[PDB]
Structures are given as structure tokens and as C-alpha cells.
Amino acid sequence: DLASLAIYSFWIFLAGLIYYLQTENMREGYPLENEDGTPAANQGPFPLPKPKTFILPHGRGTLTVPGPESEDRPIALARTAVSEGFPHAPTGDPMKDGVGPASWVARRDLPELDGHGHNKIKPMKAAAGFHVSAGKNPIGLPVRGCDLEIAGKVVDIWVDIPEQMARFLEVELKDGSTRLLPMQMVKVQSNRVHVNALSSDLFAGIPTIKSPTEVTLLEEDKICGYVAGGLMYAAPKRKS
Amino acid sequence: ALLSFERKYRVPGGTLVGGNLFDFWVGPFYVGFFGVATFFFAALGIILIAWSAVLQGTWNPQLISVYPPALEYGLGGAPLAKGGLWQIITICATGAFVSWALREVEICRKLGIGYHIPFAFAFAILAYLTLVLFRPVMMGAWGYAFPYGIWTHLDWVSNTGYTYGNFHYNPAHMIAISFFFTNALALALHGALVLSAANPEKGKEMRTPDHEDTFFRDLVGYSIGTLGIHRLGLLLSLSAVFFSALCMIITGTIWFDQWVDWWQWWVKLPWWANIPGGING
Amino acid sequence: AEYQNIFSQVQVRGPADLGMTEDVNLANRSGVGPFSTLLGWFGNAQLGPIYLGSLGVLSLFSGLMWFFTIGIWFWYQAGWNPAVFLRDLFFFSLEPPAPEYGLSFAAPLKEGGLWLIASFFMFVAVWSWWGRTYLRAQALGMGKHTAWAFLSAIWLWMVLGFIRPILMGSWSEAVPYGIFSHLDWTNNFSLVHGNLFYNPFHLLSIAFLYGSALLFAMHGATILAVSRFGGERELEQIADRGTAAERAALFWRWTMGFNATMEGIHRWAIWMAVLVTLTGGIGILLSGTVVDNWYVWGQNHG
Ligand code: BCL
Ligand code: BCL
Numbered sequence: 001d002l003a004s005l006a007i008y009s010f011w012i013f014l015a016g017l018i019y020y021l022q023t024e025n026m027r028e029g030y031p032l033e034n035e036d037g038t039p040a041a042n043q044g045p046f047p048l049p050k051p052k053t054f055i056l057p058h059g060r061g062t063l064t065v066p067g068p069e070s071e072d073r074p075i076a077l078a079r080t081a082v083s084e085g086f087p088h089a090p091t092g093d094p095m096k097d098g099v100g101p102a103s104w105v106a107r108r109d110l111p112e113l114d115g116h117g118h119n120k121i122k123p124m125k126a127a128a129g130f131h132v133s134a135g136k137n138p139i140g141l142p143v144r145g146c147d148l149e150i151a152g153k154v155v156d157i158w159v160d161i162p163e164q165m166a167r168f169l170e171v172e173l174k175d176g177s178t179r180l181l182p183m184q185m186v187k188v189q190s191n192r193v194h195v196n197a198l199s200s201d202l203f204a205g206i207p208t209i210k211s212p213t214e215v216t217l218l219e220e221d222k223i224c225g226y227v228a229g230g231l232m233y234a235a236p237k238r239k240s
Numbered sequence: 241a242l243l244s245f246e247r248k249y250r251v252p253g254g255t256l257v258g259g260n261l262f263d264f265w266v267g268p269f270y271v272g273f274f275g276v277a278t279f280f281f282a283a284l285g286i287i288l289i290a291w292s293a294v295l296q297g298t299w300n301p302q303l304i305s306v307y308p309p310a311l312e313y314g315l316g317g318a319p320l321a322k323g324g325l326w327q328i329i330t331i332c333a334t335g336a337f338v339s340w341a342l343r344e345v346e347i348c349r350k351l352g353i354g355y356h357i358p359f360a361f362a363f364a365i366l367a368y369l370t371l372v373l374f375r376p377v378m379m380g381a382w383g384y385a386f387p388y389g390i391w392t393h394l395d396w397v398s399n400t401g402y403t404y405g406n407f408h409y410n411p412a413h414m415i416a417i418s419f420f421f422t423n424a425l426a427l428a429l430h431g432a433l434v435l436s437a438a439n440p441e442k443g444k445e446m447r448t449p450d451h452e453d454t455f456f457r458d459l460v461g462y463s464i465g466t467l468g469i470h471r472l473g474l475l476l477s478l479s480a481v482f483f484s485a486l487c488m489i490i491t492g493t494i495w496f497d498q499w500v501d502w503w504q505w506w507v508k509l510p511w512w513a514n515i516p517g518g519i520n521g
Numbered sequence: 522a523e524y525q526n527i528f529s530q531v532q533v534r535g536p537a538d539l540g541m542t543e544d545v546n547l548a549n550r551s552g553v554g555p556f557s558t559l560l561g562w563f564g565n566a567q568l569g570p571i572y573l574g575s576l577g578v579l580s581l582f583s584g585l586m587w588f589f590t591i592g593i594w595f596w597y598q599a600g601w602n603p604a605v606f607l608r609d610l611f612f613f614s615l616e617p618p619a620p621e622y623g624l625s626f627a628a629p630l631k632e633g634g635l636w637l638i639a640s641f642f643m644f645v646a647v648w649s650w651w652g653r654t655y656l657r658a659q660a661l662g663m664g665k666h667t668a669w670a671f672l673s674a675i676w677l678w679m680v681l682g683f684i685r686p687i688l689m690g691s692w693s694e695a696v697p698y699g700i701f702s703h704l705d706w707t708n709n710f711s712l713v714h715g716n717l718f719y720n721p722f723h724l725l726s727i728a729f730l731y732g733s734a735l736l737f738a739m740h741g742a743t744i745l746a747v748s749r750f751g752g753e754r755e756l757e758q759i760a761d762r763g764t765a766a767e768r769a770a771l772f773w774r775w776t777m778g779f780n781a782t783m784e785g786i787h788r789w790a791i792w793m794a795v796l797v798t799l800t801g802g803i804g805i806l807l808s809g810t811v812v813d814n815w816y817v818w819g820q821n822h823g
């Protein structure tokens with residue numbers, strides 16, 4: 001009967017769909033590698049999909065995936081065991097070296113652009129008509145690290161312009177230069193901004209941006225990577 | 241064994257228990273103390289189900305059913321073959337779910353990410369425990385829990401719902417369904433929106449999140465935004481489960497009659513209770 | 522504690538965002554509505570603009586007419602008394618024609634005629650809304666995923682109110698317009714077809730509905746967990762994988778042994794959800810036309 005036919009066909013459709021979904025989800029990160037970066041012998045039962053090409057919006061070119069995978073950066077880790085499956089220990093300072101929870105990827109060293117081809121993220125002072133709308137304005141607040149010491153003062157908010165959202169606090173340090181802190185990694189309080197992930201002495205080490213009115217994708221990855229890594233690697237100094 | 245970008249994240253650290261003892265991977269899988277705990281609980285639970293299968297005289301996955309103690313046992317322990325195995329398997333399952341959540345926390349700590357996922361998973365666990373632990377304890381018997389069997393557990397759903405008439409009339413259940421439906425709606429829209437932007441018309445450039453807000457604003461006059469939609473899906477699906485748990489914790493405890501009759505409170509509000517006409521006058 | 526990014530701490534507002542132009546007729550966009558600080562704690566504060574245009578007008582108009590037709594029947598059933606109206610609101614029902622009328626349009630207004638009228642208005646509201654879904658994407662040069670996905674919901678609705686009543690040979694088979702009445706209909710539908718837990722397309726439908734909550738909890742949580750690395754800028758992460766996308770993938774690889782990409786998770790998403798009403802529509806359509814009694818059918822498996 002038609003209902004047995006239908007359910008029979010459906011199971012076949014579903015297996016095909018899962019097969020399609022799994023291979024689509026292999027457009028990044030494959031082939032699988034050994035710990036030394038050479039191709040693993042066992043790739044699984046799904047082969048790679050035929051490549052697709054995205055056309056990028058502002059003369060920025062295309063992306064074709066799957067394609068040749070490569071970290072494009074040194075990775076300061078070494079094996080801790082003589083067989084596969086164990087951790088790899090930082091060979092230096094994992095925060096400065098950008099490994100473990102402090103990792104960053106080699107994204108393009110250009111800012112994300114909005115639909116009109118303008119920089120998506122800007123310091124509020126350079127963003128016409130933007131202002132604090134609701135909530136405690138953090139600008140001017142002292143910034144406190146997990147060691148309960150003051151690391152600097154908030155001098156601006158970096159806003160997402162098309163999405164009208166706060167993305168970073170710009171924080172000025174004792175020596176007069178500034179750093180960006182991810183909004184998601186700060187707690188705005190009535191009399192301070194509190195930064196759980198970093199002790200005061202780690203603020204100087206936040207990666208800097210090469211131009212003071214824009215951030216590149218590569219820069220945001222280094223900053224966000226570095227601050228999140230403090231949760232594991234400051235932790236000695238953090239005192240709750 | 242590793243994704244092309246994976247090695248830089250496989251550093252030591254983040255475990256909650258045991259230091260470096262279980263800090264390793266088996267192929268793609270992280271272990272950790274709680275991987276070991278979950279293996280233990282899951283393996284024991286599965287073995288006890290297998291034993292249960294042999295005591296019931298079947299290997300057929302569609303016949304295997306593990307039943308809780310009959311109502312007469314109340315909340316005491318029952319002989320293995322008369323609900324005892326269900327009791328132990330339940331403890332194994334709870335151990336395995338909670339271990340699984342705690343292993344997720346270990347993975348979050350290693351990766352330097354927030355804890356949103358195990359926190360979300362904890363709602364599913366609380367729904368499970370409402371059905372097999374909190375509801376049965378409040379009602380005074382393990383036998384109020386559902387049996388572990390593919391088909392028999394649907395028997396339980398059906399028998400339990402009709403114990404209260406048409407279960408659609410449970411107001412917490414209406415709220416729960418609304419979140420489930422709204423959630424699936426939001427999932428469809430979210431997957432579609434992003435894909436429609438990453439996969440424009442043939443030969444066009446990828447769209448931007450600005451085109452996403454634009455499309456929604458054009459369509460319904462409002463866009464939630466790319467952060468908003470993920471907050472929203474998390475909230476719809478956890479609310480669905482929260483209200484599911486709620487709709488059962490109250491059923492058989494504070495309300496145990498035909499759910500349809502609950503609605504008479506509204507109909508009988510004294511200011512309109514007696515006006516003739518309508519359906520109820 | 523650590524901030525969780527469920528609500529925003531600080532809201533920021535700029536000039537009203539009129540949106541991308543592409544091939545949109547700007548004459549059909551309204552002005553911006555009012556900014557909502559309330560909504561701004563969770564998502565965007567901006568309301569509008571909306572695109573209206575001819576097709577949207579037609580849709581809004583017949584949608585309203587659908588709702589007013591039911592409404593006027595409710596008032597009638599209420600004896601035009603406002604107190605009875607609020608009291609019995611969940612109990613009123615605009616019911617389809619009796620079986621003897623078959624598929625004819627010959628039933629008196631009060632006996633299914635008004636249900637036919639309301640349904641006509643509903644039918645044009647939804648189909649014109651679907652066209653809109655398609656053209657709003659077309660005008661921006663986007664893919665048609667929203668229209669295709671919406672079609673899956675429309676499939677279930679069409680099966681319920683139109684295709685199945687037609688194959689059964691009467692409008693009396695369709696769903697009534699009423700809060701409680703449509704729930705009674707649903708319970709009833711299961712009873713009369715030998716218990717819908719034996720309809721394997723209904724069972725699949727449930728798996729996908731649960732699976733949608735599972736997946737949106739997983740994905741919403743994952744993206745918030747990586748929002749400290751810009752994770753929710755999914756397009757740019759698709760275009761240029763960042764540490765957000767890598768940490769999200771690796772959370773799941775380490776947990777369950779496999780993972781998605783920033784694009785591919787959206788494929789699992791659209792399909793998990795769409796499959797709900799796709800399998801459901803099939804299960805409902807087969808009921809009574811091909812299978813009278815699912816219990817019996819399951820016994821034969823056919
Ligand atoms: C699926 C099998 C059954 C069915 C079974 C159930 C069950 C079981 C339940 C519902 C519930 C709902 N159903 Mg029903 N429902 C069916 C088909 C429909 C259709 C349709 C066009 O096909 C509609 C419009 C509704 C409408 C509704 C809503 C009243 C309510 C919440 C739905 C929701 O969250 O949607 C998605 C969410 C959105 C936010 C988008 C849409 C917004 C609004 C809320 C949609 C409702 C509009 C409504 C017609 C206006 C009410 C008028 C007032 C009384 C003035 N159902 C079919 C026939 N439905 C629940 C409920 O609370 O019932 C009381 C419930 O428990
Ligand atoms: C005839 C039956 C009655 C009825 C009676 C009941 C009863 C009885 C119940 C519901 C419940 C629910 N019903 Mg009702 N219901 C009816 C009609 C409906 C209709 C409809 C369209 O008509 C709908 C949409 C619903 C919707 C719902 C949801 C609100 C809720 C189910 C989801 C849930 O709780 O998840 C919660 C999620 C879980 C419990 C999953 C937990 C998973 C755990 C943590 C992990 C598992 C790991 C696993 C072992 C993995 C190992 C293997 C592999 C590695 C994968 N009902 C009819 C009227 N309904 C249930 C509820 O609210 O429960 C709290 C419930 O008990």
C-alpha cells in the first residue's frame with residue numbers, strides 16, 4: 001500500500017539527507033590530520049564534497065571549500081607523550097604565543113565591512129549619531145582585574161554600526177596607550193568595570209591594533225583569544 | 241584523528257577532578273574524569289538492560305522493556321525482576337547524564353568558552369528527573385514513572401494523558417507546546433535566513449548581516465538581530481522544556497481531575513458567571 | 522559572576538537604519554517605528570521600516586478579514602454581549618459545513634457558509650504572504666530558503682484545511698476556528714484513526730519537533746558560548762573561519778565525536794525544522810484517504 005511505500009521512500013530520502021548534511025559539514029577542517037600535521041590514514045566513511053565557491057562582497061575575492069587547509073602561523077606546543085591522544089604543552093608563554101584557550105586564527109588582516117563597504121566596528125566617538133541608549137554608560141569607569149587592582153580606565157565603546165551593538169570597551173592603560181576588551185568579557189558595575197579573565201598586570205599584553213580607529217578580523221581574533229585564555233592562564237593571580 | 245585546526249587547542253588543563261590523570265582524548269573524544277564516570281554509568285546501565293532482556297526472554301530491541309516497581313511497592317526498593325533493575329538503571333542514567341554535563345564543563349574550561357551548553361543540557365536532565373524522580377516521589381510511588389522501552393514508553397504517555405481526559409487542556413502543557421512550535425518556527429527562519437544570505441542568487445556576492453536585518457524588517461517590520469536570534473532559540477527551547485517539566489510536576493499532585501474542568505474558574509468568575517447566552521449560559 | 526550575554530548590559534543607538542536598497546522599491550518602505558529599549562535588552566531596539574507594497578496590502582487585508590469573520594461569528598454566538606464574549610472566548614467555534622454538503626458551497630452562512638468565507642480569506646492571506654517571502658528575498662538578491670521552508674509549514678496547513686477535506690469528499694473534515702474546538706478536533710482525529718501514535722509519520726514528526734528544541738538549544742547555546750570571540754557574526758565566520766567557529770566545532774567533536782561548520786549547522790537547522798511539518802503533512806494526508814486505522818495498518822505494516 002501507498003503508506004508503506006511512502007515510509008519506505010522516506011527512510012531512503014532521510015539516509016540521503018544525512019549523507020548530504022554530513023558531507024556539507026566537512027567543507028572545513030578536513031582531511032583529518034595526525035598530530036604532526038600530516039594526513040591521517042583514517043578519514044571516515046564520508047568523502048569530501050565537491051568544492052563550492054563563495055563570492056565575497058567588496059572586491060575581497062572568493063572562498064572555495066573544501067580547499068587546502070593550513071594554520072598559516074607558528075604553533076608553540078610540543079608533545080607530552082610518545083603516543084597519540086595526549087595534550088601538547090605550551091613551549092613558551094601560552095598567552096603571548098596564542099595557544100590553548102588563548103588561541104587565535106589567521107583571519108584576514110582587514111576589518112569586517114558592512115553592506116555598504118564601510119568598517120562594521122568603530123569607536124563610538126567616530127560613529128555619527130551613536131550614543132549610549134540604556135544601561136550604565138561605562139565610559140570613564142576604572143577597569144579592575146581579577147587581582148582586584150585597577151588596570152586602566154574606559155575611554156570609549158567600539159560599536160557595531162549596522163547591528164547597533166557594543167562590541168568592545170577601549171581601555172586606557174597607565175602608560176597612555178589603549179587596548180580593546182570584548183564586551184562579553186566585562187562586567188559593567190555602578191562604580192567600575194570588572195574583568196574576571198585578566199589580572200591587572202596582563203592588560204599590557206593584550207594585542208594592540210595597528211590603527212586606532214579600526215580593528216581587523218585578525219586583530220579581533222588575537223584580542224578575544226588572549227582575553228579568554230586568561231581564564232585558564234591568569235588563574236594563579238585571579239583571586240575570588 | 242584531528243581537524244586541520246585542532247592541535248593548538250589540545251593543551252593540558254581544565255579538568256575538574258583528577259588533575260592530569262584523565263586529561264586525554266580517544267580519537268576525537270575527550271575523556272576527563274567525567275568521561276570515565278559516564279563510561280562507567282552508561283556501561284553498567286546498558287549491561288543491566290541486557291540482563292533485564294534475558295530475564296524477560298527477548299533480544300528484540302522493540303520488545304525490550306524495563307518497568308518500574310508496581311504501585312504496591314510505593315517508594316521502597318523492589319526485587320530486581322519486579323522493578324529493582326529499573327531503579328538501578330535509573331540511577332545509572334542519572335549518573336550518566338550528569339557526568340555527561342560535567343564532562344561538557346571540562347571541555348568548556350579547556351576551550352575557554354562559556355558554559356551555556358551544559359547549562360542548557362541540564363534542563364533536559366531536569367525534565368527526565370521530573371518524570372522518573374520528582375513526580376513519582378511527590379505522588380508516593382516509583383510506579384508513576386515511565387517504563388524504558390521504545391513502544392511501552394508511548395503506552396505510558398498515552399495512558400497518563402488520558403487519566404486526565406484530553407491532556408491538551410493542561411494550561412502549562414499549552415504554554416509548553418507553544419514554545420515547542422515557536423521554537424521550530426524560529427529554527428526554520430534562522431537556518432533559512434543565514435543560508436539565504438550565504439547562498440545568494442547565482443553569481444551574486446554573499447549577503448551581509450545587514451541584508452538579514454533588512455529582509456526581516458521588510459517582511460514583518462522587525463529584526464531581532466544576529467545575537468538576538470540565538471538568545472531567542474535558546475530561550476524558546478529551554479522554556480518549552482521548563483513548561484513541560486512544570487505541566488507534569490503539577491499533574492497528579494496539585495491537580496488530578498479532568499484538565500478540561502480546570503477552565504471553569506474563568507467561566508465562573510462571579511461578574512459574568514450567570515449571564516445567559518454564549519456557550520456556557 | 523561571569524557575564525552570560527543573555528541580556529545586554531549597555532545599549533547603544535545610532536541613526537535609524539533604513540536598510541539595504543538592492544532592487545527594493547524604496548517607495549514601498551514605511552518610515553522607522555519607535556525604538557524599544559525594552560526589546561533592546563534582548564535583541565534589536567529598532568522597529569521598522571516595513572515593506573508593504575500591493576501584495577502585502579492584499580495579505581494584510583484578507584488576514585484581517587479572516588480574523589474579523591471568525592470574530593463576528595464569536596460576537597453572534599455571544600449574543601453580542603461583551604461579558605459573554607470574554608467569558609466563553611475559548612469555547613466559541615466557527616465550524617465547517619456538515620458532511621451532507623460535501624464539497625459544495627451550498628451551505629447556509631450560519632451552517633458552514635461563514636467557515637467557507639473565512640477560509641477563503643485565510644487561503645489568500647497565506648499564499649500572498651508566501652509570495653512576499655519569495656519576492657522580499659528576490660529584491661535583495663538572496664536565496665529562496667525562507668520561501669521553501671515556509672512552504673513546508675504551508676504544506677501541513679493545506680493538508681489540514683484543503684487537500685485532505687477535498688480527497689475525503691467534504692469540507693466537514695477540515696479544522697474549525699476556535700481555541701478549544703481545534704484541540705477537540707485534534708484529539709478526535711487521533712481517536713477516529715486508531716491512535717496517531719501508530720502513524721510512523723506522526724512519530725517522525727515528533728522526533729523532529731523534539732530534535733528542533735535539541736538543536737536550537739545546542740546551537741543557540743554554542744553561539745552564545747563563543748560570542749566572546751564574535752561567534753554570532755556567522756556570515757563572516759563562514760567566509761573566513763575564526764577562533765569562534767573552531768572552538769564551537771571542537772566543543773562538539775570532543776563531546777560527541779563529530780561536528781558541524783558555521784554554514785553546515787544552518788543546514789542541519791533548516792532541515793530538522795522543515796521535516797517537522799513535512800513528515801506531519803504526509804502522516805495527516807494518508808489518514809482516512811489511504812489508512813483508516815493506523816493500529817491496524819501497523820499490524821500488517823500495510
Ligand atoms: C498541530 C495539530 C493541530 C494543532 C494542535 C495544537 C495544540 C495541541 C496546541 C495548539 C496551540 C496553539 N495553536 Mg493549534 N494546531 C493546529 C493548527 C493551528 C493553526 C493553523 C493555521 O493550522 C493555528 C493558527 C493554530 C493556533 C494555535 C495557537 C492558538 C496556539 C499556539 C500556537 C503557536 O505557538 O504557534 C506558533 C507561534 C507564533 C508566536 C506565531 C503566531 C502567533 C499567534 C499566537 C498564533 C495564534 C493566532 C490565533 C489564531 C489568534 C487567537 C485569537 C484570540 C483568542 C483573540 N493552530 C493543528 C490542527 N495547537 C496550543 C494552545 O495554547 O492552544 C490553546 C496547544 O496547546
Ligand atoms: C495521548 C497523550 C496526550 C499527551 C500527554 C502527555 C504526557 C503524559 C506528557 C506529555 C509531554 C509533552 N507533550 Mg503532550 N499529550 C498529548 C498531545 C500533545 C501534542 C499535540 C500536537 O497534540 C503536543 C505538541 C504535545 C507536546 C508535549 C511536550 C510539551 C511535552 C513533551 C516534550 C518533553 O517533555 O521533553 C522533555 C525532554 C525529555 C524528557 C528528554 C530527556 C532526555 C535525556 C536528558 C537524555 C537522553 C540521553 C539518551 C539515553 C541518549 C543515549 C543514546 C544515543 C547516544 C543518542 N503533546 C495528548 C493529548 N504529553 C511530556 C512532558 O511534559 O514531560 C515533562 C509528558 O510526560
Ligand code: BCL
Nearest residue numbers: 286368386390391393397723724725727728729731732735
Ligand atoms: C519527552 C516526553 C515523553 C516521551 C514521548 C515520546 C513520544 C510521543 C515519541 C517519542 C519518541 C522517541 N523517544 Mg520518547 N519520551 C520521553 C522520554 C524519552 C527519553 C528519556 C531518557 O527521557 C528517551 C531517551 C526517549 C527516546 C525516544 C526515541 C526512542 C524516539 C525518538 C526521540 C527523538 O528523536 O528525540 C529528539 C532527539 C534526537 C533527534 C537525538 C537522537 C536521540 C535518539 C534517537 C535516542 C535513542 C534512545 C535509545 C533507543 C534508548 C536508549 C539506548 C541505550 C543506549 C540503551 N524518550 C518522555 C516519557 N518520545 C518518538 C518515537 O518514535 O517513539 C517510538 C515519539 O513519537
Ligand code: BCL
Nearest residue numbers: 674675678707708710711717718723726727730801802804
Ligand atoms: C490526542 C492527540 C494525538 C495527537 C494528534 C495530532 C494531530 C491530529 C496532529 C498532530 C501533529 C503533530 N503532533 Mg501529535 N498527537 C498526540 C501526541 C503528541 C505528542 C505527545 C508528547 O504526546 C507530541 C509531542 C506531538 C507532536 C506533534 C507535532 C510533531 C505535529 C505538529 C507539527 C507542528 O509544528 O504543527 C504546527 C504547525 C502548523 C499547524 C503549520 C501552520 C502553518 C500556517 C501557514 C500558519 C498560519 C498562521 C495564521 C495565518 C495566523 C497568523 C497569526 C498572526 C500572524 C500572529 N503529538 C496524540 C496521540 N498530532 C500534526 C501532525 O502533523 O501530525 C502528523 C497533526 O495534524
Ligand SMILES: CC[C@H]1c2cc3[nH]c4c(c3C)C(=O)[C@H](C(=O)OC)c4c3nc(cc4[nH]c(cc(n2)[C@@H]1C)c(C(C)=O)c4C)[C@@H](C)[C@@H]3CCC(=O)OC/C=C(\C)CCC[C@H](C)CCC[C@H](C)CCCC(C)C
Nearest residue numbers: 282285333336340360361363364389390481731734735738
Ligand atoms: C532542554 C532542551 C532540549 C535538549 C537539549 C540538549 N540535549 C542535549 C544537550 C542539550 C543542550 C547536550 O549538550 C547533549 C548532547 O551531547 O547533545 C548532542 C544532549 C543530549 N540529548 C540527548 C537526547 C535527547 N534529548 C532530548 C531533548 C532535549 N534536549 C530538549 C528538547 C530528547 C527527547 C526530546 O526525547 C532526547 C532523546 C542525547 C543525544 C545527548 C545526551 C547524551 C548523553 O547523556 O550521553 C551519556 C549517556 C549515554 C551515552 C547512555 C546512557 C544509557 C543509560 C544508562 C541507559 C538508558 C536509560 C534510558 C532512560 C532509557 C530510555 C529508553 C527510551 C526508549 C525511552
Ligand SMILES: CC[C@H]1c2cc3[nH]c4c(c3C)C(=O)[C@H](C(=O)OC)c4c3nc(cc4[nH]c(cc(n2)[C@@H]1C)c(C(C)=O)c4C)[C@@H](C)[C@@H]3CCC(=O)OC/C=C(\C)CCC[C@H](C)CCC[C@H](C)CCCC(C)C
Nearest residue numbers: 421424425428584585588646647650670671674794795798
Ligand atoms: C516548518 C515548521 C514551522 C514553521 C515555519 C515557518 N513559518 C513561517 C515561516 C516559516 C519558515 C515564514 O517565513 C512565515 C513568516 O513570515 O514568519 C515570520 C511563517 C509564518 N508562520 C506563522 C504562524 C504559524 N506558524 C506555525 C508553525 C510553524 N511554522 C512550524 C513549527 C504556527 C503553529 C505552530 O500553529 C503558527 C500559528 C505566521 C507568523 C507567519 C505566516 C504569516 C501569514 O501567513 O500571514 C497572513 C497575514 C495575516 C494572517 C495578517 C492577519 C492579522 C491577524 C490574523 C490579526 C491579529 C491577531 C492577533 C493575535 C491579535 C492582535 C492584532 C490586532 C491589532 C488586530
Ligand SMILES: COC(C)(C)C(=O)C/C=C(\C)CC/C=C(\C)CC/C=C(\C)CCCC/C(C)=C/CCC(C)CC/C=C(\C)CCC=C(C)C
Nearest residue numbers: 589591592640641644678679681682683696698699700703
Ligand atoms: C474584538 O473583536 C473583534 C470582532 C474586533 C475581533 O476581531 C475578534 C475576533 C476573534 C476573537 C478572532 C479569533 C479567531 C480564532 C480563535 C482563530 C483560531 C484559529 C485556529 C486555531 C485555526 C487552526 C487551524 C486552521 C486551519 C488548519 C485552516 C486551514 C485552512 C485552509 C488550508 C484554507 C482552505 C480554503 C478553503 C476551504 C476555501 C476554498 C475555496 C476556494 C474558492 C479556493
Ligand SMILES: CCCCCCCCCCCC[N+](C)(C)[O-]
Nearest residue numbers: 018022043044045268778779780
Ligand atoms: C540523527 C543524526 C545524527 C548524525 C550522525 C552522523 C555521524 C557522523 C559521523 C561523522 C564522522 C566524521 N569524522 C568524525 C570521521 O570526521
Ligand SMILES: CCCCCCCCCCCC[N+](C)(C)[O-]
Nearest residue numbers: 459460461551552571573584650
Ligand atoms: C505604514 C503603516 C503600515 C502598518 C503595517 C503594520 C505592520 C504589521 C504587519 C506584521 C504582520 C506579520 N505577520 C503577518 C507575520 O504577522
Ligand SMILES: CCCCCCCCCCCC[N+](C)(C)[O-]
Nearest residue numbers: 721722724725728732789792793
Ligand atoms: C536531519 C536530522 C536527522 C535526525 C533523525 C532522527 C530520527 C529518529 C527516529 C524516529 C523513529 C520513528 N519510527 C517511525 C521509526 O518510529
Ligand SMILES: CCCCCCCCCCCC[N+](C)(C)[O-]
Nearest residue numbers: 044045266267268269777778779
Ligand atoms: C542516533 C545515534 C547516533 C550515534 C552516532 C555517533 C557518532 C559518533 C561518531 C564518532 C566518530 C568515530 N571515529 C571513531 C570514526 O571518529
Ligand SMILES: [Fe+3]
Nearest residue numbers: 430740744755
Ligand atoms: Fe546560527
